[PDB]
Design a protein around this ligand. Structure first.
Ligand SMILES: Nc1ncnc2c1ncn2[C@@H]1O[C@H](COP(=O)(O)OP(=O)(O)O)[C@@H](O)[C@H]1O
Ligand SMILES: Nc1ncnc2c1ncn2[C@@H]1O[C@H](COP(=O)(O)OP(=O)(O)O)[C@@H](O)[C@H]1O
Ligand SMILES: [Cl-]
Ligand SMILES: [Cl-]
Lengths: 306, 306
């Protein structure tokens, strides 16, 4: 029941963003002790979720793979209820979705066999999902969960879409545990950068694994891979950017009552991409992104109503 | 805080049963929709759980492997609270436990990377756990989750303990999804039978995968592997047994209001082993086992208070 709007050969009635990655089932403590509430999250899904609330008149699509069990159907229903277009979701007969459990907060997860790890199994389906997207967004988690072949399939699809005028956006989102080794991680992340117009790295993660001395070194590294607009998040600190050789800095207004940094980066990315799609200048988009993330860290959970 | 009693060189103050396998975190629907209650289950653990309630003066030990996270510590606390001796539990630094989710009932599970899959990594620790056990109990699930090397380690430990006067009990508990193929499953199950004094197969499962024509064919197959007492469960039907060439049948009194067959076999096994350890004749032990399982299928969940 998500409105997809109309189209002719040349234009679609809705601006269209596609987000590609893994959505996770999540269980978080409910009020009665020993009980947990079931919901859905996951980095790229979270960004799609914030996007659907920022621009509910637009088309926000999610591309992934899920199972055919009850939990997978619950997940599909959740996306629709969030105003997210899940029409491109692939179903993998023998598998189920990934899950994480928050304990009371500690995170445990199970995703090694998730259906989403096959999301790049069908090159045609990937290409069709991107074809008329204004922006295609993916993360280093999207890359991490795929095998060698799937990664190549995804990067080729991204590169071809980029060449037809899709704007490609990438959050490195470094999570070493999801990679076989950090050598593989850093190498593959930079392959992702090589197909992206916009990159949204977070500095402290980059500094740990790449050895970046500062946010400007981070930007330079991405710009070296051909990224046109690099926006470097850095916690409570100013956001440095680099766009076509031009550097800039955008302040991040102090937030008191920081509660939970969950989805800080995911919501930043949504606020940023929302504003870029509206045709606002990068400095303005970064300011908007920081404002949204500022509210998000003041709320509990990955999906905060703002 | 579980009482282990005392011992001298020759006897221990408590009868001692060891159960070896995987305990699972489980989430089942709570009263408020969208919420689930966290508990712990898993076939061999369930049997240990019923055993601790049948003979709370005895020592009921559980041997497995868990992680070092909060969920693993919750599981360890649960065993202790159930009066189960978890002193032999091994901790695997980088892993967590397996989980299953009941949806509202459909079962989804995540166990491919669970710490319990390493429970046979330390041959010394296995041997020490069995050393003064009166009965050692394991299942085909215990075998399924181990790799080739772990399986060999477990079977050697079981065979050596059997030779020193441990009574070895085995429930084939056939779950094809946990095996690479059904050829591997049937072969390995019969290796388990080859080290067992008592086998507790369920007929309909055996008929599907082995091709057994009837419960007597099932018993014969196990007796051929050297099993001394084969007790064949068969749903609501009479229990056939075979002990040292002697056949027998024990009736299963009709149960009305069957609600949930979860742990029917696990509780049967507990009622049976409890009665064997008390020195009761096999026919009497089977009658007791059927009575307990009869109550268990009249209650919700794997762990029913009887
Ligand atoms: N301590 C903080 N105070 C205020 N804003 C923050 C804070 N941490 C993060 N943010 C906002 O969220 C954005 C993303 O920060 P980052 O730490 O990279 O996200 P994550 O924690 O998801 O990795 C920042 O640009 C900032 O706007
Ligand atoms: N429909 C039933 N009515 C009465 N007792 C039952 C029924 N199903 C199982 N039981 C009891 O539980 C025991 C185990 O049966 P089984 O079906 O092998 O367990 P499971 O369902 O766990 O495989 C039986 O011997 C019987 O005593
Ligand atoms: Cl048209
Ligand atoms: Cl002594």
């Amino acid at each position: 029941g998500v409105d997809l709007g109309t189209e002719n050969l040349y234009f679609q009635s809705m601006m269209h963003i596609l987000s590609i990655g893994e959505c996770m089932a999540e269980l978080a403590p409910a009020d009665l002790p020993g009980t947990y509430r079931l919901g859905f999250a996951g980095d790229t899904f979270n960004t799609a979720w914030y996007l659907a609330r920022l621009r509910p008149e637009s088309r926000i699509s999610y591309f992934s793979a899920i199972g055919d069990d009850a939990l997978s159907q619950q997940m599909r229903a959740a996306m629709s209820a969030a105003g997210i277009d899940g029409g491109g979701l692939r179903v993998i007969p023998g598998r189920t979705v990934g899950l994480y459990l928050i304990t009371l907060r500690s995170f445990a997860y199970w995703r090694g066999q998730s259906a989403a790890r096959e999301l790049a199994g069908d090159a045609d389906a990937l290409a069709a999902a991107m074809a008329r997207a204004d922006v295609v967004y993916f993360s280093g988690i999207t890359l991490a969960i795929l095998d060698q072949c799937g990664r190549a399939t995804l990067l080729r699809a991204l590169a071809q879409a980029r060449a037809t005028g899709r704007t490609i956006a990438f959050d490195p989102n470094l999570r070493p545990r999801l990679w076989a080794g950090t050598g593989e991680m850093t190498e593959t992340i930079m392959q992702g950068a090589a197909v992206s117009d916009i990159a949204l790295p977070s500095f402290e993660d980059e500094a740990a694994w790449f050895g970046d001395a500062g946010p400007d070194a981070t930007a330079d590294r991405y710009a070296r891979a051909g990224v046109r607009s690099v926006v470097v998040k850095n916690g409570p600190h100013a956001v440095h950017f680099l766009q076509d050789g031009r550097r800039g800095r955008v302040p991040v207004p102090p937030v008191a009552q920081v509660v939970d940094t969950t989805a800080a980066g995911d919501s930043f990315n949504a606020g940023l991409l929302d504003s870029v799609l509206a045709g606002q200048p990068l400095e303005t988009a970064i300011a908007a992104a920081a404002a949204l993330a500022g509210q998000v860290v003041q709320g509990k959970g990955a999906l905060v109503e703002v």
